[PDB]
Every structure is written in structure tokens, then in C-alpha cells.
Amino acid sequence: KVVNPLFEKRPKNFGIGQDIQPKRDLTRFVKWPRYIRLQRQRAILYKRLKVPPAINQFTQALDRQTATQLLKLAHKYRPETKQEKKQRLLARAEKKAAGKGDVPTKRPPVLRAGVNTVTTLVENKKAQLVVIAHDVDPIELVVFLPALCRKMGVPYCIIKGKARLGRLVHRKTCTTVAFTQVNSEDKGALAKLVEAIRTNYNDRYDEIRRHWGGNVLGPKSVARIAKLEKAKAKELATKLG
Template structure:
């Protein structure tokens, strides 16, 4: 004997008909059934240059500058008042104005800036104005120079006499690695597979008997 299930009168059954001209079928994710083409995006040279940074031994800017004590409350108040007065008269000394006036000895940029479009033009602008620049790893490390949590760009204008020798070393290294290095500005970046895709191709090459090192994995 079969027991009949009681139907709730508040909810009426409305079966769907997915025939032609009837109910619209719900969209489902079919990406796992798609064989995606093997293409990898290329990064233009203006953005790819931010992946080339100074090595840790050369980038000694933060080590020499962290010994400088932060400004006191009185000095900070005077600094803010001077900045506000300069802004009111249209003489705000930001990084672009200092570079344009050629009053900067060195411009340092961080490589992990979130909004890269805000600073992507600075290397070309520095080369045009004849100002040395370099790119270092970590905006947090660069922030320690100006006693902040993070910093995207730091311009060195006035340096103590005892740090002039170290500044000259940094400027020469910046010219050799960035300002006067023509080949780096023409190199395209990207074109590499992800870690998951690389491991998959490596397993496939190993199963087929090929050498994983000569399977040209990870390059375009």
C-alpha cells in the first residue's frame, strides 16, 4: 500500500517546459567543458620595467636613511604651514615640479604600486629631464625612508654631506641599470604560464617520456 504525500496548498507545482518557445533554460557554467586556447598576455615595456629592480646590496637607500630621526611636532607644523602657503600661491613642490626644475638628485620608485598608471610615465619623464631614477622592491621599504607605512615615489633633493658619497654610488648604479640602459626599456614582459598550467604540462611531458627541462614549459 502506497502512502500519498500531502501537498501544501500554498505552493502550487509549476513544472517547466524547456521546449522551443517555452521556458528559458537557466544559464550554467560550462567553462570546464571548454578547451581554452594556449595564449598568454604580453606586458608592454613601460609596465614590464617595474619588474626589474635594484638588488638588495645596491639598494642601500633605506639603511642609510632610517638613522635620520623623524621631524618633531614643531618641525612638522612649520613644514605643513610652508606647504600650505606654497600651495596657495601655486608653488607646490611636488615630485613632478622638482623633476621639471631639475632640483632632484635621484628619484626612487616602488615596484609594487597598485595604481601603476599614476607613475608609469615617471621613468620616461626622468630620462627626458636628465634626472636619475631607480626602482626598488617594496613600497613598505621605501616608506621607511620618509617614516611612513608606504611610499610610491621618493625624490631626494637635499642630502647631508656625510651621505653624499653613498648618494653618488646610488646615482651611478641607477644610471647603469635604468637611466642609460636602453635594452631594458624595449623588453616585453609576461608571456609566462601560471604555476598550475606549468605543473600540468610538466606531468604530461613526464608521462610521454620527454624531458621536462627541454619541453619548453613556461615560455611563449
């Protein structure tokens, strides 16, 4: 057609010693600072050593679909903010002398947060469900709660997120959340999750206690012990038959 004949492909090539290299993505090879390397080599080192089952058990958290329905239920039971607590008590304390008097008012069943609160609840069977976060960074504060909730016999679930439990108690993070009494309009939602949780945690907990974790190798190490196998496993089966 009528295209300009002065338009011309000049294809440069990128062999060795030829025209120089382009700006390709070097993101594997860069000099990272020593807080980034510190936390990437830390995450590799939790899968190179034998991780005991009291630390392994916070990896097999609850599935993404059925932990979402838990948070959808535990959203009506979030503790109140002070900005609703102050606005109530300007009218709730107003209703003593005008004109109720006692006003017992039936303290609503809400969530109870904190690992020191919810441990008191399970030791005397108050709890109904113990929601536990998986990535407490000093991971020794909840390493006894799957042990303790099995012996007391309440259901417990590991939930993928610490700041997602914290975002429903109006703080930054929250370690554990415990369900106690529930309203009668949605008690049936508890007898949908509890028999679906404790088949994963309580009914199989002797299985967890010998289920060691970690102890896999690098992708370079696991693929160098596949060439030595496939070199061995190409004539040793051919020797027979």
C-alpha cells in the same frame, strides 16, 4: 635487553581500500574563499599575458644588497615628526626676541615624498635621485616616471617595496621619494650609488622599452610541451648518424 615484550609494532598501511587515510596536508586542494582565489588568479594572470614594458619595468627592481645601503643613507634625511616639530617651535620661535631676531637657520636638506611633489622637482632638474616603489596597486601613476627621468636626465631606481618607503615618511605607504640636496658629510655616498644605479636604468632604457614581460605558461602546460618534444627528439636525431 630488559624491554617489555608487550610492546609491539602494529604498522597500519594506506593502500586503496585498506586502513583509511591520515590527516595529510591538503593545502593545495582546499576550497578557498573568493577573495583569495581572486588575488591568486590575478597574480597568475600577470604572467600569462603580454605585459607591456611600461608595466614590466616595475619588476626589475634594485638588488637587495644595494637597495639596503640606499635606505641606510636615506634614514638621516627622513622628514621630521610633528612631535619634534612642535618641540622645536617651543624653543625655535622662542629665539626671535631672545635674542637672535632673523635666525635664518638653514632649512635642512630632507627627503621629499609624493608623486605630485617629485614630478615637479624632476621637470626643472631639482632632483638628484628618484626612488620609486614597484607595487603601486593602480599601476598607472608612475608608469611615466622612468620615461620622464630619462628625458630630464636624473637617475631613478625601482625599489622593492611601497610600505618600506612609507615607513620612512611616518605614513603607511609612499609611492615615490626624491633626493634633492645632500649634506657635505655624505656627498660621496651619492657618488657610490648614482653611477651604480644609472648603469641599470638610464644607460639601458632603450633596452627596457622593447623588453616585454609575462607570457610564460603554466607548469602543467610547459611540461606537456616537453613530452611531445622529447618524443619527437628521440628518433629524429637517431635518424642521422
